[PDB]
Each structure stands twice: as structure tokens, then as C-alpha cells.
């Protein structure tokens, strides 16, 4: 069988047995054991021991700090180096770069970024030989959709950090079960490496392993792998959500016929208690975690959560989108969360969740900017720096709460449910502090696939059509295509398109809507317009509501013809900066209907 001991493992196994994986999974295993070199291999099998021995080790480590105040919640703080994704040191290989992104026109892709394999094996090598040494490689098997759903697919993550074990327990169905459903079907190659072998060459910075200067984030869709070095944070090292549920899957969603994209999915019911399913995009930062846990300020209105991130999206034999939410919980931005800004994540949080740069105060409870609480007369905060902090922000602007899905007061009835949730409507936005209205709706399918595709977001106004400029797993002029492929679908039941914008301001600059809760008034509107409701008025960028259609009882200064206004100037330019992106950035991939649609815009603009 072997001239040594040679590729056997066995002996290094702390958990599980290497003779009970699938041996497509053992040779995953074994074969990257081979290259990092890890000391000890531990299977993870999900439990609460473990779990629990998970975290106890990491205490001892100095890596994480339990907040005392609360049910089993935890506090990461990380190296200031490592603090978010990082989109320039995200590469997708393809034989053909036109395979991942448009070949542009005059300039460099904004769209992605694209890398040979013959740089990336180069890379690859320069990393990963000997990168676990004196560490154990957790073998973390893992379910993106409920154990069983027709859209769920199944990844095996390697990783060196017990960081990322405990925060993919949260975010994935994770453990034993997961193997066993998995049998020899197919499944997602995820390495992952913090990249300190032991012992250390660069003193560590508050106990958080990381290699900044080598950092790459690698997906390699023709192999189905992700492979990932040097980061330990959030989407850089939970190769589930943005990697696999997002880059991975869109790939795979444009082969198969389904979607993967940047959307929250809410269940909204009306004070007659008819209920509607819609799923919205903004980029990073821009509210979808606000909106898909929203307290609705309007009587008998209810809003439901089936997730806030991610939402995988197939049309039925009966022609309705039906959508999942693939994650297990919810890796929401801290700061700004309040009690009047977000009460339900509120409510989450403050069991089984673990903390990354926020700020802890003295009695062993969690601080950040927008938090919107006094602390009690004595009460002293230590910063995401480690640092004695007064009123330099306390909490790292990126910093993040992890989160049982499951813990959400308002979690939906349907969260789980294989078949997932029947999609009405489609909401895009993002931030634009001037001349984008409050709301307005799509004039045809085509037109509102532009609407994605046209999409724009302050930090600088940049373009993030779909909200997935950091997430396209293939050529965006081919998402483009298959997105406007789902009117040609028979018997489709195509979702009503809109556009939000939450941040416009004033000459004073302050916000002009007030936002949050008082986005239910918004919904409401989108409600009526799913139901045929005759409440729109015809402009040249789409329908908006009429004089009185929304509801805006009890606000009561709210300037509509400033927030409804449409400024030819403005829009005059705004698709001149749409109409460069496009043939700039998708060029020869730009489909026909895209074109058409930015044309009927200018000429509609041009009438005014
Ligand atoms: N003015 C205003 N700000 C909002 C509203 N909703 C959210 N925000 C702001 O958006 C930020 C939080 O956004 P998130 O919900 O964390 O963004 P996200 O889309 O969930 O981001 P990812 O989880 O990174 O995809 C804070 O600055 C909030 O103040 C709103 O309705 N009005
Ligand atoms: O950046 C985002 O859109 C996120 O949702 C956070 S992360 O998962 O990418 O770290
Ligand atoms: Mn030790
Ligand atoms: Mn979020
Ligand atoms: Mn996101
Ligand atoms: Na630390």
C-alpha cells in the first residue's frame, strides 16, 4: 500500500477517524495535511462539548475573552491589519479571463479581479507549504441550507484558526450530520490558513494570528475550491458566506438555472394579516440587516427575518422565485445597532453570540458608536484597541456581532422550510445623498435588471450593480444575460422591481427621511403595487407614488417634492456616468436589453 508511514495521517487525528470520512473528503484531508503540515487534525463534529471546549481553549489562549455580562457571549479583538474583506486581494482563476470578468474597454475592471493559474499557483506555493506547522487543522463539514433543501450545498473547510470553527458553528450547519448527508456526493473544497506557522517569524498583535502582506482570498470554480491565506476575519476566513454562498454559487446558479445574490429575504405581513415575501440588495453597509429585522412603526404591520445576507433563488415547476436564505445566522455590522435602530438584533445578541472590535466595558458588557445608552455612573470602556477609552471611535467601524439565526424573536415561521419562500417583489439601493428618490418601481422586467445593473452607492458615489460588485463569480455581462433569461422562463411569475434610497440630504446636509422603522411607510406603498393597487404616477425613471399614496401620518416634516423630486440635470448626468461604466466595464458582454433600456432612459430624460 505505502514503502513508510509516508501519507497516512492517522496518527495525528485528535478527533474523529480519518477511515470514516468519505474518500473524496479524506484525500482533501490528507492531501492538505501533506502540504500545511499541521501538528494535529481534529474533525469537528458540531457538539455543544465541543463547542464548549472550543471557546474554553481560546480563553486559555488570551485569544477571546468572555463578556461576563451576558449568556455565553465572547469578545475577539483582532490586529488592526485585519479588519474586513479586502477586495483588491480577492481573486477569482479561470483559464479564460473573460470567463470571470468583461474584458474593458479603455480601463481596469472594477467587476472583479481575475488571475492566471499560473500567477496563482506561484502564489499559492509562496503560502501554503509548511503554513500549519505546530497548529491543529480543524476539518469543519458544513451544510449552506437547511440539512436536507433541494438548493443546499455542502462544503469541507480546513482552517487553523478555532476562531473560524466557532464562528462557522453559527453561521453554517455544521458537524457530524453534515458528513453523513453528505456521503460521496459532490462538496466545496475550502482551505483556509491564518498563515503564522509555528514557531512565529513577526510578533502577533493582541493574540490575532494573520499574514496582511500575504493575503489572498482564491476561488477556483473549475476545481470547486476556495482557498484563502493570511486573513482571520469575517469574509476572508468564513469561506461558507461570501466565498461560497455568494462567488462560488453564482457560478454554479448561471450552470443550473438558479440565483445567488447579496439580498436580505423578509417576510412582511399588513393589519389584515395578508403576507407578502421580498428580498432587497444593497451593498455593504447600506441596511439590509436594518430592514429584514425591522420594528415597524405602522399599526399591525409585521416584518419577518429569513435572512439578511445572502438568499439562493430558483423558480418552482409552478413558475413562483422561491428563496432560501443558505446562512445559520446573522454577521451583522455593531455599530449604529440601537435600540430604536435595530431592537430586534438587539434582543438577539446577547446570548450564544461572539463579538469582533467592539468595545467592553467594566462590567463585562458590550459599547460601540450609535449604541444610543447610557452606562451606569462608574462604568468604564475599554476599546476594540485594548485600550482605556473616554468620549478615536471605541468599536473598529467594521466591527461585527455573530449570531444564531435561530435566537431572532422575529426569526420567520419559513426560515428553514426546504422549499423556501415565494418572492414577490425585489428591492434595490444604496446610499445616494442627492437626486435618487425615496422609492420608485421598474417599468418592465428589462428595465429593472437595468435598475440592478445601474446601481450606485456613496463609500465617492461608486457602482455596485446588483450589490455584487465584490462578489461576481463570473462575467457580470453573463449575470446581465441571466438575469433578463428569467422573462423567457414559461410560466415564470416575475417579481415586481423597486428602487429605494434611505440617505438622501438636505443643502444642510441631514438626512431627509428619517429611515428604519418609518421604512415600513415605504413597504406598505410596495405592498399595494404587488397587489395591482392603482397608487403610481408615471416618470421618466419609473413609477412613483402618487400625491397621498404613501402613508406619512405623524412625521410630519417631511419635504416630498424634495424627496420625490426628479431633477433633469441630475438625472442627465447620471446616465452619462451609467452609460460610460457600462462601456467601459462590460463592453462586448454588455447584453442588447441593457443598452436598449439606458437608451429609452436618456430619451425619456431627454423629454423632460
Ligand atoms: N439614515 C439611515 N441609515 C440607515 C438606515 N438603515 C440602516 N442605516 C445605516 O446603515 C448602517 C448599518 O448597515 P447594515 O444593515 O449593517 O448594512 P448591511 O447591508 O447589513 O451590510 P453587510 O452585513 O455588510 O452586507 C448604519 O450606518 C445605519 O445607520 C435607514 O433606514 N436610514
Ligand atoms: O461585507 C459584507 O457585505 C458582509 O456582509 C460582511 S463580510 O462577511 O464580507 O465580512
Ligand atoms: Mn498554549
Ligand atoms: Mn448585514
Ligand atoms: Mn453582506
Ligand atoms: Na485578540
Given at each position: 500500500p505505502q514503502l513508510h508511514n509516508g501519507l497516512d495521517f492517522s496518527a495525528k487525528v485528535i478527533q474523529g477517524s480519518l477511515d470514516s470520512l468519505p474518500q473524496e473528503v479524506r484525500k482533501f484531508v490528507e492531501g492538505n495535511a501533506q502540504l500545511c503540515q499541521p501538528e494535529y487534525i481534529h474533525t469537528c463534529d458540531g457538539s455543544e462539548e465541543e463547542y464548549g471546549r472550543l471557546l474554553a481553549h481560546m480563553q486559555e489562549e488570551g485569544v477571546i475573552r468572555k463578556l461576563?455580562?451576558?449568556?455565553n457571549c465572547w469578545l475577539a479583538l483582532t490586529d488592526?491589519?485585519?479588519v474586513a474583506r479586502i477586495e483588491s486581494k480577492t481573486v477569482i482563476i479561470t483559464q479564460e479571463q473573460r470567463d470571470t470578468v468583461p474584458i474593458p474597454k479603455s480601463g481596469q475592471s472594477q467587476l472583479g479581479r481575475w488571475m492566471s493559474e499560473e500567477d496563482f499557483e506561484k502564489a499559492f506555493n509562496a503560502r501554503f507549504?509548511?503554513?500549519?506547522?505546530?497548529?491543529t487543522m480543524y476539518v469543519i463539514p458544513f451544510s449552506?441550507?437547511?440539512?436536507?433543501?433541494?438548493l443546499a450545498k455542502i462544503g469541507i473547510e480546513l482552517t487553523d484558526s478555532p476562531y473560524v470553527v466557532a464562528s462557522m458553528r453559527i453561521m453554517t450547519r455544521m458537524g457530524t450530520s453534515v458528513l453523513e448527508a453528505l456521503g460521496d456526493g459532490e462538496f466545496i473544497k475550502c482551505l483556509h490558513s491564518?498563515?503564522?506557522?509555528?514557531?512565529?517569524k513577526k510578533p502577533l498583535v493582541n493574540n490575532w494570528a494573520c499574514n496582511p502582506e500575504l493575503t489572498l482570498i482564491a476561488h477556483l470554480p473549475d476545481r470547486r475550491e476556495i482557498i484563502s491565506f493570511g486573513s482571520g476575519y469575517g469574509g476572508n476566513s468564513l469561506?461558507?458566506?461570501?466565498?461560497?454562498?455568494?462567488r462560488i454559487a453564482s457560478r454554479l446558479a448561471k450552470e443550473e438555472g438558479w440565483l445567488a445574490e447579496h439580498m436580505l429575504i423578509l417576510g412582511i405581513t399588513n393589519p389584515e394579516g395578508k403576507k407578502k415575501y421580498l428580498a432587497a440588495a444593497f451593498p455593504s453597509a447600506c441596511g439590509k440587516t436594518n430592514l429584514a429585522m425591522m420594528n415597524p412603526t405602522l399599526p399591525g404591520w409585521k416584518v419577518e427575518c429569513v435572512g439578511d445576507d445572502i438568499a439562493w433563488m430558483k423558480f418552482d415547476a409552478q413558475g413562483n422565485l422561491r428563496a432560501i436564505?443558505?446562512?445559520?445566522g446573522f454577521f451583522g455590522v455593531?455599530?449604529?445597532?440601537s435600540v430604536k435602530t435595530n431592537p430586534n438584533a438587539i434582543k438577539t445578541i446577547q446570548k450564544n453570540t461572539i463579538f469582533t472590535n467592539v468595545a467592553e466595558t467594566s462590567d463585562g458588557g458590550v459599547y460601540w458608536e450609535g449604541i444610543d445608552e447610557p452606562l451606569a455612573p462608574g462604568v468604564t470602556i475599554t476599546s476594540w484597541k485594548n485600550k482605556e477609552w473616554?468620549?478615536?471611535?471605541?468599536?473598529?467601524?467594521?466591527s461585527r456581532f455573530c449570531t444564531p439565526a435561530?435566537?431572532?424573536?422575529?426569526?420567520?415561521?419559513?426560515?428553514?422550510?426546504?422549499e423556501g419562500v415565494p418572492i414577490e417583489g425585489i428591492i434595490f439601493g444604496g446610499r445616494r445623498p442627492?437626486?435618487?428618490?425615496?422609492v420608485y418601481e421598474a417599468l418592465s422586467w428589462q428595465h429593472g435588471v437595468f435598475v440592478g445593473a445601474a446601481m450606485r452607492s456613496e463609500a465617492v458615489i461608486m457602482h455596485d450593480p446588483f450589490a455584487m460588485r465584490p462578489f461576481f463569480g463570473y462575467n457580470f455581462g453573463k449575470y446581465l444575460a441571466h438575469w433578463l433569461s428569467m422573462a423567457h422562463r414559461p410560466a415564470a411569475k416575475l417579481p415586481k422591481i423597486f428602487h429605494v434610497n434611505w440617505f438622501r440630504k438636505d443643502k444642510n446636509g441631514k438626512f431627509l427621511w428619517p429611515g428604519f422603522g418609518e421604512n415600513s411607510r415605504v413597504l406598505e406603498w410596495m405592498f399595494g403595487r404587488i397587489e395591482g393597487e392603482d397608487s403610481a404616477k408615471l416618470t421618466p425613471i419609473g413609477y412613483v407614488p402618487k400625491?397621498?399614496?404613501?402613508?406619512?401620518?405623524?412625521?410630519?416634516?417631511?419635504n416630498v417634492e424634495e424627496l420625490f423630486g426628479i431633477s433633469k440635470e441630475f438625472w442627465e448626468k447620471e446616465v452619462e456616468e451609467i452609460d460610460k461604466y457600462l462601456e467601459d466595464q462590460?463592453?462586448?458582454?454588455?447584453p442588447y436589453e441593457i443598452e436598449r433600456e439606458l437608451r429609452a432612459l436618456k430619451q425619456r430624460i431627454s423629454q423632460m
Amino acid at each position: 500500500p505505502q514503502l513508510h508511514n509516508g501519507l497516512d495521517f492517522s496518527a495525528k487525528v485528535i478527533q474523529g477517524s480519518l477511515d470514516s470520512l468519505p474518500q473524496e473528503v479524506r484525500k482533501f484531508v490528507e492531501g492538505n495535511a501533506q502540504l500545511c503540515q499541521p501538528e494535529y487534525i481534529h474533525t469537528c463534529d458540531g457538539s455543544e462539548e465541543e463547542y464548549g471546549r472550543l471557546l474554553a481553549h481560546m480563553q486559555e489562549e488570551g485569544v477571546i475573552r468572555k463578556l461576563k455580562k451576558y449568556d455565553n457571549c465572547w469578545l475577539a479583538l483582532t490586529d488592526p491589519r485585519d479588519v474586513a474583506r479586502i477586495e483588491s486581494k480577492t481573486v477569482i482563476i479561470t483559464q479564460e479571463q473573460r470567463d470571470t470578468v468583461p474584458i474593458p474597454k479603455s480601463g481596469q475592471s472594477q467587476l472583479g479581479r481575475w488571475m492566471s493559474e499560473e500567477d496563482f499557483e506561484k502564489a499559492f506555493n509562496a503560502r501554503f507549504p509548511g503554513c500549519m506547522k505546530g497548529r491543529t487543522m480543524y476539518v469543519i463539514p458544513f451544510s449552506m441550507g437547511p440539512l436536507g433543501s433541494p438548493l443546499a450545498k455542502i462544503g469541507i473547510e480546513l482552517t487553523d484558526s478555532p476562531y473560524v470553527v466557532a464562528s462557522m458553528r453559527i453561521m453554517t450547519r455544521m458537524g457530524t450530520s453534515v458528513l453523513e448527508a453528505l456521503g460521496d456526493g459532490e462538496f466545496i473544497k475550502c482551505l483556509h490558513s491564518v498563515g503564522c506557522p509555528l514557531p512565529l517569524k513577526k510578533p502577533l498583535v493582541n493574540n490575532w494570528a494573520c499574514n496582511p502582506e500575504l493575503t489572498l482570498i482564491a476561488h477556483l470554480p473549475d476545481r470547486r475550491e476556495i482557498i484563502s491565506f493570511g486573513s482571520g476575519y469575517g469574509g476572508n476566513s468564513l469561506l461558507g458566506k461570501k466565498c461560497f454562498a455568494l462567488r462560488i454559487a453564482s457560478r454554479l446558479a448561471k450552470e443550473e438555472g438558479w440565483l445567488a445574490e447579496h439580498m436580505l429575504i423578509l417576510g412582511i405581513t399588513n393589519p389584515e394579516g395578508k403576507k407578502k415575501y421580498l428580498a432587497a440588495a444593497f451593498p455593504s453597509a447600506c441596511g439590509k440587516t436594518n430592514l429584514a429585522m425591522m420594528n415597524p412603526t405602522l399599526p399591525g404591520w409585521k416584518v419577518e427575518c429569513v435572512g439578511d445576507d445572502i438568499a439562493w433563488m430558483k423558480f418552482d415547476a409552478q413558475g413562483n422565485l422561491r428563496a432560501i436564505n443558505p446562512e445559520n445566522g446573522f454577521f451583522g455590522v455593531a455599530p449604529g445597532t440601537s435600540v430604536k435602530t435595530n431592537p430586534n438584533a438587539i434582543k438577539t445578541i446577547q446570548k450564544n453570540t461572539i463579538f469582533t472590535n467592539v468595545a467592553e466595558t467594566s462590567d463585562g458588557g458590550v459599547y460601540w458608536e450609535g449604541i444610543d445608552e447610557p452606562l451606569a455612573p462608574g462604568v468604564t470602556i475599554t476599546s476594540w484597541k485594548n485600550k482605556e477609552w473616554r468620549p478615536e471611535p471605541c468599536a473598529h467601524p467594521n466591527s461585527r456581532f455573530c449570531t444564531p439565526a435561530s435566537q431572532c424573536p422575529i426569526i420567520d415561521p419559513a426560515w428553514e422550510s426546504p422549499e423556501g419562500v415565494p418572492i414577490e417583489g425585489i428591492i434595490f439601493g444604496g446610499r445616494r445623498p442627492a437626486g435618487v428618490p425615496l422609492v420608485y418601481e421598474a417599468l418592465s422586467w428589462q428595465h429593472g435588471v437595468f435598475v440592478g445593473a445601474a446601481m450606485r452607492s456613496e463609500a465617492v458615489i461608486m457602482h455596485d450593480p446588483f450589490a455584487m460588485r465584490p462578489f461576481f463569480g463570473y462575467n457580470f455581462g453573463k449575470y446581465l444575460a441571466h438575469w433578463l433569461s428569467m422573462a423567457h422562463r414559461p410560466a415564470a411569475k416575475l417579481p415586481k422591481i423597486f428602487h429605494v434610497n434611505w440617505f438622501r440630504k438636505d443643502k444642510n446636509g441631514k438626512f431627509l427621511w428619517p429611515g428604519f422603522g418609518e421604512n415600513s411607510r415605504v413597504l406598505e406603498w410596495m405592498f399595494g403595487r404587488i397587489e395591482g393597487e392603482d397608487s403610481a404616477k408615471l416618470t421618466p425613471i419609473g413609477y412613483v407614488p402618487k400625491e397621498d399614496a404613501l402613508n406619512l401620518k405623524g412625521l410630519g416634516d417631511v419635504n416630498v417634492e424634495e424627496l420625490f423630486g426628479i431633477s433633469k440635470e441630475f438625472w442627465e448626468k447620471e446616465v452619462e456616468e451609467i452609460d460610460k461604466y457600462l462601456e467601459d466595464q462590460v463592453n462586448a458582454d454588455l447584453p442588447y436589453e441593457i443598452e436598449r433600456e439606458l437608451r429609452a432612459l436618456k430619451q425619456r430624460i431627454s423629454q423632460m
